[PDB]
Amino acid sequence: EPMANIVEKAVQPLLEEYRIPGMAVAVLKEGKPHYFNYGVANRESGRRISERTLFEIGSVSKTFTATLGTYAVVKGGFRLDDKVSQHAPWLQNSAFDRVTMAQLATYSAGGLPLQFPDAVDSNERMRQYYRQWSPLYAAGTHREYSNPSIGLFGHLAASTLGQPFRQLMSQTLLPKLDLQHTYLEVPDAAMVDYAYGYSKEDKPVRVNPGVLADEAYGIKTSAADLIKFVGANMTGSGDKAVQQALAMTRTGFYSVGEMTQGLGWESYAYPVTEQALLAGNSPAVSFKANPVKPFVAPRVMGNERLYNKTGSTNGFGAYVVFVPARGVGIVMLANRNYPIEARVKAAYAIMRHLAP
């Protein structure tokens, strides 16, 4: 039962039902990446999808943001249990005197919403938004997945090292991870590689700037670079501080059902049922506030576990999953924003074949 036939069997129903123009799949197994490419980057250009095509990975970006944050912890910028206002004096006498940096990163500050209100379109309006925000829940008790929440975490983390987020990401973290095809903004020389997204109206679309977009959803990368980042999260980085940063993202803070929330990555005990993996990625978890089952203290989660993250933009749909103990990772990048349940079912089938 060859890998190639397992991947085809899992992916073809996606390509068919969702009319996906282009998909790049990368599988890491036995210490080597394997690439499976389908379709086109741009319906109005000749270049086919390859493992070098750049896709918008949307909220998978939060795994990079989390790693920048833990890098700042390693470098002494802050501690995860610090109050947010320690690092943002403009938030003195706000909710953020009680919220911790870890709670921002884990969407548990107390009901920060999925998106900023549309009116928040500048740095000053962003600052005012956080100053004015009235919590819905006590700090730490509820998970409400939130771009403003992890966005502020990344912004403040970089500030503790005296740098803008984009600078620290592009000049320190990505180079130390040796990621040469990963961008917050795609440079001119790489534009030939940048796919277009295809919206639910079948129109070609690209992500536009937004408040804390870099932190929450802004990375463009290839399947080759993203599977390299997955590998770093399994067998490590040769940069000592980056390795400490990567390891620290495995810190779990609470659970919701069978899912444990870490920094960026969400994880499950492995073996994991398909039902549990679907539930943890479902709208009931992703787009509703859920009361958490708290941990007494944050806990490093282990190798015998499945780590994952979904992400989407207008016209793009990404999913990444890996099991460190098994040495298997899967990256699926598409230029259609197709259903998360379908991403999960396909990846689950591939994973069950490669880690029975």
Ligand X SMILES: *C(=O)N1C[C@H](NOS(=O)(=O)O)CC[C@H]1C(N)=O
- Residue of 45, 50, 59, 122 with catalytic role: 59
3 state SS of 84: helix
CB within 8 Å of 227: residues ≥ 6 apart: 26, 27, 28, 33, 329, 331
Phi, psi dihedrals of residue 191, rounded to the nearest 5°: -60, -35
| Count of helices and strands (H, E) across the chain | 13, 16
Smallest separation (angstroms) from ligand X to the CB of 282:
9
Distance CA 281, CA 272 (A): 13
Among 286, 295, 345, 349, binds ligand X (CB under 6 A): 286
Print the binding letters for residues 125-154 with ligand X: x by CB under 6 A, - otherwise. --------------------x-x-------
Distance CA 135, CA 317 (A): 31
CA dihedral angle for residue 209, residue 211, residue 214, residue 216, rounded to 10 degrees: -120
Residue 164 or 210: the one with the smaller Cβ distance to ligand X is: 210
Residue 62 or 353: the one with the smaller Cβ distance to ligand X is: 62
Q: At how many degrees (to 10) do helices 147-160 and 61-74 cross?
A: 30
Smallest separation (angstroms) from ligand X to the CB of 214:
13
Q: Which residue is nearest to ligand X (CB)?
A: 59
Residue with tokens 């990846």: 347
Restricting to residues 74-103, name those near ligand X by CB under 6 A.
none
Residue 156 or 344: the one with the smaller Cβ distance to ligand X is: 344
If one asks whether residue 233 binds ligand X (CB under 6 A), the answer comes out as: no
Distance CA 327, CA 231 (A): 8
Smallest separation (angstroms) from ligand X to the CB of 7:
22
Residue 179 or 216: the one with the smaller Cβ distance to ligand X is: 216
Q: At how many degrees (to 10) do helices 240-248 and 223-235 cross?
A: 90
| Count, residues near ligand X per rule CB under 6 A | 10
Residue 160 or 313: the one with the smaller Cβ distance to ligand X is: 313
Residue 83 or 336: the one with the smaller Cβ distance to ligand X is: 336
Among 15, 24, 28, 58, binds ligand X (CB under 6 A): 58
List, in sequence order, the alpha helices (H) in 123-273: 123-132, 147-160, 165-168, 174-176, 213-217, 223-235, 240-248
Strand order of the β-sheet with 220-221 is: 55-56, 220-221, 182-183
Restricting to residues 12-51, name those near ligand X by CB under 6 A.
none
What DSSP designation does 140 have?
T
Smallest separation (angstroms) from ligand X to the CB of 72:
22
Smallest separation (angstroms) from ligand X to the CB of 151:
10
Restricting to residues 163-222, name those near ligand X by CB under 6 A.
217
Among 42, 59, 67, 308, binds ligand X (CB under 6 A): 59
Distance CA 330, CA 165 (A): 28
Restricting to residues 300-339, name those near ligand X by CB under 6 A.
310-312
Q: Known catalytic residue: 61?
A: no
Distance CA 179, CA 323 (A): 21
Smallest separation (angstroms) from ligand X to the CB of 248:
22
Q: Which residues bind ligand X (CB under 6 A)?
A: 58-59, 145, 147, 217, 286, 310-312, 340
List, by residue number, the catalytic residues: 59
